[PDB]
Structures are given as C-alpha cells and as structure tokens.
Amino acid sequence: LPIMHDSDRYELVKDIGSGNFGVARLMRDKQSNELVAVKYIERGEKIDENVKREIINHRSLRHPNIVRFKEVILTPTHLAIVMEYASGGELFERICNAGRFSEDEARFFFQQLISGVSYCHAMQVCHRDLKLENTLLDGSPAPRLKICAFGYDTVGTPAYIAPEVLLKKEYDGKVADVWSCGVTLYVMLVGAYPFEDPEEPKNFRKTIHRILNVQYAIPDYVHISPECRHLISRIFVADPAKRISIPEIRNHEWFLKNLPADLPGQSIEEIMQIIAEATVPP
Amino acid sequence: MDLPIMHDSDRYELVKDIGSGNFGVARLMRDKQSNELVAVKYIERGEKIDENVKREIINHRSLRHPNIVRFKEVILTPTHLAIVMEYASGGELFERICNAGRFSEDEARFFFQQLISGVSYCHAMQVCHRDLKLENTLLDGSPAPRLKICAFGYGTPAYIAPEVLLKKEYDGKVADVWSCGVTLYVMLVGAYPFEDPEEPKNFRKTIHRILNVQYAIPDYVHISPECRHLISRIFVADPAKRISIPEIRNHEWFLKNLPADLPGQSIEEIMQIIAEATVPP
Ligand SMILES: [Au+]
C-alpha cells in the first residue's frame, strides 16, 4: 500500500485490509475531522474505461444513506480513490449485539434502507452494484445507515438471493433488491436469517430449497404488528411479478409510521484530467 | 450444550438464544418492569453447584459500580439455577477500536477513565486479576457508550505482565495495571503492543517483546507527552517500579476532563436458592 500523501489535508489514521471497504487506507480530514477511506489502483494499464466508469457513475450518487465518493488524487504510483467511511461497523453486528431489534428500531433503519435503494434505482443502479447484504453504520451517536455501491472476513448468506435469481439467468435486478431488503428487515426483527437453518447454515441445499419454496416462520416469541407481518408476506413472494415494489412499500402503512419527511467537489473535467494523467506509469 | 426452556415468562420477555461470544452460551431477555435488557447463564442442578459457584455468585452480587457488569438475580429451575445479570449490548470495546482505526487521545482518555474507576473499585473489594476479564471489556447500548467490565465468568498474551510470566509470587493488582496499559495502547494505536501485527500467532516473539518491554508508538500516531509518559510508567517490567492505580488516579493525563462522579435481591433468597439447586431433578 502506497505511502502517505497530502499531510496538509489528511492524517493517516490506520491502514486496513479486511472489510467491504476492501484493502484501504483510513484517514482523517484535518479540517472536517471527517473519517474517510482511500483505495488505490496502480497507475498504468489498470486505469481503464470500466474504472473511469465506476468513478463517474459513483460520483453521481449523492443520497446521504450511501457511501459517497469524495475525490480523486494522483500519486506517482497509483490512483487513490477517496470516499466516505462508515465508522459504525456493520448493521449485522449491531443486530447480534442487540439479540434483535424492536419493531420501531427495525422500522427506523428500514426507512433509510428503502430511501437509499429507491434513490439508487432512480439512478439505474440495481442489484449487484449494491451491497445490500452487508449494509453499514456511520459513527454518529445516532447511527445512519450506509450502503456501499461499487467496491471497484465477512460471511455472506445465500438467503439474500431471490428465487428467480436462483432459477434464472435473466431477471429484474430492482425486484431482486426488494427481496434482499426483506431479508434485512426479517433479520433485524428476528435476529436470524430467514430460510437459512440456524443450526446447519452450511447446508446450502436446504437453505436454497427453503428460498425456492419461500418457507419462513416468524418465531413465536417474536411479536410484530399485523402491518409489519403483512409487508413481510408481500416481500417474500417467489414470483417477481407479484412481489411488492419499492414505491408500493413507500406507501405501505408500516413504512409510513414515524417516517421523517426528509426522506463543491471536483469538475468532472479535472476528474477526467487526473484519470488520464494516471493511465501512464512512470 | 443446549439450554432449558423459557421461564418466568411474566417478568421477562425472551429476546434471543445465543451460543457463544463473551457472555458465553446464554440467553438474552427483557425485564418488562424496567425495560432493561439482561443476560442469563445456566448451571445444572447438583454437583456442579460447587463452592466456587457459591463464592462466585456471592462475590458477584456484592458489586455495585456503573462500570462493572452487574448481578441482577438468581432463580431456580427444575434443571438449572438461573443467574441473571446486566447485559452490555454495545459489543466489545475492541470492535469499536477496529471500526475507528484508532481513537483520538480524548476518546481513549474518556474510556480509560472509566476503566480505572472500575478497576480501582474492584481492587478495593479485593477482586483482582483473574476475577476481571480486562482483556475483553464491553460497552452498554448508550449512544455515548459506557465501559462495562465482566467480573467472574462461570487470547493475546499482550495483556500478560512480565512478572505473571516469570515470577512465582506476584501481586494481581499490579498485573492489572499492566493490562490496563495494553488497553490504553491499543485504543491509541489500533493495534496491540509487543505483538507483531504481521505475526500475531508468533507467541514466542510476542513474549520476548513483553519480557524486554519492547514497544514502539508509530510515527503517525501523535500523543501528548503526558500520555506518552503515563504509558512509559505502566510498561515497566519490574512490578515494584510500575505506576500504581492511585498514582494513575493522580496523573495529569488521567485528570484532564475527568468527570467528578468518578433494591437488590436478599442475600438469604440467594443462599437459599444456591442451596436448593444443589439437588438434581
Ligand atoms: Au526470540
């Protein structure tokens, strides 16, 4: 990992290498005191089109519940991509710490989740560009949800995979995403993944089976409003045609409860200048 | 292995069954009369209910400090005695460090203050050393997390003091001071001292560095001279010469921004029940 740059702007906090921020550098902005992550791609043949793509693509994303691009820098050696860093850890970890959430806390996060997914869809980012199986939390004393988009250790359950995705080579990514969000809601409320047998999580055949046949069962000791239960039943629908849609959720009674109403970087020119300047290696 | 079945279903709402971690294999449930969240450990009626268990529970029940994981109550089941205590829902302090990369000197001081408060208190109660799980402290659910130390239980050799490795007789309280130094360091640096980060399972090399007190605050980590001094005063191989808890309580770094603040169950019920659960259905 390439050495420490712009001491005037950023302080090296810590080099990390095992999250979903990838292998990265953790740095503080000596003005905002803001925490930021910094990825790196050697200068040369790597600085290609699909990169430039990702960078521009990403910058477009501006919704707060997203891990936002900040800036691009040029070193002699590398391309450094600097973005927001969620210092609050994984949402899953908070769940495990809690045992499970109250329906109201689950609703609080789920609102942010839908807001960010909706926004991302409205910029045409479906499915596999979105790490909806491992969402994170910012550092704040009141935690904001933070979704990673484009990554240029952590266990990922197959439970996140929608049945049509299991069964088919082509599908609507947005609908699949809805399924995913269902998984996250469930896990928040139950403290365990649906479909997955908690005692043989590595029995993938069994898991997949239950996904295909939509076999889930809210524990007797878990008690949720009938509205909530309904919403869940409306997401866990095998037929993508019949699965509730994002807007439909945006108007669902459970979703609307206590819903907050809220729900100067670089010239793209100079960005392109630095990408260019970066495609050649001294 | 597997737990007995939800009980006292009128005082407590079952939150979750868990099988590992720091609260071991246990049960999370909620007291409906405080809203507070609790954890439950289970021992099998009869022989296992030994004198160490008696002593451990009694000693546990004795402690009342906001930085210590607190005893709530004990309960009898057909199969098990149920011990109910406070549950730190904020996870491990270490996890928060990793999430942060490292702490600012002020945040590290904020937690370290609580650390010393709780250790000091435990010492005054003659609870040293192995009674404290000082290598794995925890946080409550507070948005502004409170440090929570597990006492009595029912990793990295970094925490072990040179004398604990070498000498036959040692003071557990002084050893504890060393431990607290480790915690401070790791908060500030984001890594354990002594332990080679690229060779964490090299316990030989680690131990070597412990015995020779070989540590090195990274160039990119910048701490006040007061802080650096304190650390130099804790990481002393000779226990005789190591800074003491009271000495720390009066150290300038410690005192900065120091907050000034720094209905149980009857002993009879308790003893009664520990006695009754000596017999196994
Ligand atoms: Au050696």
Swiss-Prot record, chain A:
Its EC number is 2.7.11.1. The phosphorylation of Ser-32 may repress the ABA signaling pathway in absence of ABA. InterPro entries: Kinase-like_dom_sf, Prot_kinase_dom, Protein_kinase_ATP_BS, Ser/Thr_kinase_AS. It is an enzyme of class 2 (transferase). It comes from the Eukaryota. One of its GO terms (biological process) is stomatal movement. This is Serine/threonine-protein kinase SRK2E. It comes from Arabidopsis thaliana (Mouse-ear cress).
